[PDB]
Design a protein around this ligand. Structure first.
Ligand SMILES: Nc1ncnc2c1ncn2[C@@H]1O[C@H](COP(=O)(O)OP(=O)(O)CP(=O)(O)O)[C@@H](O)[C@H]1O
Ligand SMILES: Nc1ncnc2c1ncn2[C@@H]1O[C@H](COP(=O)(O)OP(=O)(O)CP(=O)(O)O)[C@@H](O)[C@H]1O
Lengths: 345, 348
């Protein structure tokens, strides 16, 4: 069946809306991004810390959030010339305004009843609360999706997300799913090329690849921008591209070492997040993990930029299939649980 | 199938827990009442008006609320020798802490995911939000249940709920379901007998029945609800026996109810009374005298115990959800049309 997934993370720049086809495999049919208006962003941020009149404020803020979400859903469907009747459900994360599992609560707003009213599509939402009710942290959610996609190959695999920072899901046969942070991802390379060339990032890692790794600098680094700038002053003036090359090597070494310490027999590293598009970084990771095949998740039909939205569409599917949606090995929950709640159209 | 219903009103005394069998008819199998501790009542009340730190406070309060609800479900099932697997779903009203349909929102707490986790039973909850989303007031919800129970091809009926206050569902054949608020129910009689005798309420209305209606006082009251409000009225009248005041308060409710009811439905053939007021023998007697063309009787005579009507409505709403049948009455709520109400939190 077909599902929409709706995600809006804590950066509040906009909403990711994806449309998947789900059967034996998960396939991305379409995707859409909708920027969040400045006014909505502030009112949400103002709810992310304790303040007065929160019940009423959150109730009114979520109405605006839902209207925007419904607009985005309508827009994606229009683009695909698809009737909402062709979609089984929307999996909506909502918007986190408070997440405090130590006090046994997590709060995502996003009035799913209104989302169903406006879209005419069944909504599955409120995915974190059941994991928390069962003693979990209510996060992370995506490793369950990683496991369903890539687990059970009888193969030791790592699903590596390279965003600003790096994190990995380890899928080892006969072992619990594991998850941990690997180190910096794109954060410094982005910071360095922005500072030096006004680029948001290093496309294909081409700037890094044109430079030459400085081993003195690399050694200092291994033993943010001001943090980096502090290091560069302690060396003669280095070409900016050599700096970039050294920053790439820094990420490649930190990721590969963290991964291999936890899963030395890793056979495949599947890379998602924007770092999967960094050709130079991907090449170096492969060199540093010579017993593992390193490839983008794209090679498996999962576009690396859309992992999160697709996970939420998938969670809608899991709910309706009466299958568990959490990964208690990573959330700390007592066991597998059905995640979410159904608000029918 | 079998369903649990969980009701907790704005009076904040306790939770109604009911077990029904639902097929062509709705039948009460078992019921349970669980008092709410003062500390929880106080903390809930404090969330009913705007205040500080509400998100975190509500989250902590609802966890205690859910723990109590789950124990109540457990006890009912223990008494009935029933496993949670024998229950199809719980329909939970939750606890209302803010209701402002004019601002298009209504808020019931009661973490349904936690309720499903603790009970091991599928939970259907959050019934008001879809009605509000469709432009309605999100209330009242019970008239749709009243309709399913008592709506008939040939009888003008009024289903009258007498709690602290009174509200009625008008069921006219070939006509839309109607609903409205009929005035005070037990609120003043309860306050007056508590003040004068330290009783929680006037059992069978016997104290009121021992008194005599004062027509001057009745006329003043009707020319207009709490104890200071009454004391202010008593100040404008000579000193009356306490029982006469109680008798006059009963007559106030009886006349206000009958007059609103008869004005809206002059051809009323049956008044079916539920809520605790149905147990007030003296009040029931006066309602019957004031509506002589209608048969005035407890819902018990129609197979629905009057104390458990509201809880049973929420059990019924869980059934309506699972059957994808509408749960609201848009003519009474003002919603755009019929809607499936609620959200499913599966036990899994
Ligand atoms: N073609 C490309 N070449 C190199 N890096 C790329 C790239 N496309 C994306 N990236 C990297 O991915 C980052 C964005 O991916 P990310 O996983 O962090 O998304 P997000 O969390 O910001 C939404 C960019 O800042 C950049 O570092
Ligand atoms: N045996 C009896 N004799 C007389 N009155 C009785 C009674 N049993 C119950 N009552 C009355 O019923 C009242 C409770 O009414 P009910 O239970 O229907 O209200 P409720 O629990 O729904 C709260 P609300 O007032 O918000 O509706 C008591 O306060 C009392 O006045």
């Amino acid at each position: 069946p077909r599902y929409l997934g709706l995600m809006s993370g804590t950066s509040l720049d906009g909403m990711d809306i994806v449309l998947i086809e789900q059967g034996d495999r998960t396939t991305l049919l379409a995707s859409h991004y909708l920027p969040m208006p400045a006014g909505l962003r502030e009112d949400i941020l103002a709810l992310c810390v304790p303040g007065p009149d929160e019940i009423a404020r959150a109730a009114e803020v979520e109405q605006r959030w839902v209207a925007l979400a419904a607009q985005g859903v309508r827009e994606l469907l229009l683009q695909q010339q698809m009737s909402p009747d062709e979609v089984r459900a929307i999996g909506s994360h909502g918007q986190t305004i408070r997440h405090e599992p130590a006090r046994h609560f997590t709060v995502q707003i996003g009035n799913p009843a209104l989302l169903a009213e406006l879209t005419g599509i069944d909504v599955v939402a409120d995915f974190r609360r059941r994991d928390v009710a069962a003693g979990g942290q209510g996060a992370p959610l995506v490793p369950a999706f990683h496991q369903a996609l890539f687990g059970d190959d009888d193969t030791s695999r790592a699903v590596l997300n390279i965003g600003g920072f790096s994190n990995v899901s380890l899928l080892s046969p006969g072992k619990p799913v594991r998850g941990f942070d690997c180190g910096p991802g794109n954060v410094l390379m982005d910071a360095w090329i922005h500072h030096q060339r006004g680029e948001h990032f290093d496309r294909d890692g081409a700037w890094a690849a044109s430079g030459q790794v400085n081993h003195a600098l690399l050694a200092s680094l291994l033993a943010n921008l001001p943090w980096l700038q502090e290091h560069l002053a302690r060396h003669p003036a280095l070409p900016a591209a050599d700096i970039q090359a050294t920053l790439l090597e820094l990420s490649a070494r930190s990721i590969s070492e963290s991964l291999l310490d936890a899963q030395p027999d890793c056979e495949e590293v599947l890379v998602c997040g924007g770092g999967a598009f960094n050709t130079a970084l991907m090449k170096r990771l492969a060199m540093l993990m010579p017993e593992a095949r390193v490839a983008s998740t794209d090679e498996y039909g999962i576009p690396p930029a859309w992992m999160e939205g697709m996970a939420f569409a998938w969670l809608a599917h899991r709910f309706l299939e009466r299958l568990p949606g959490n990964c208690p090995d990573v959330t700390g929950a007592l066991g597998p649980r059905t995640l979410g709640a159904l608000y029918p159209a």
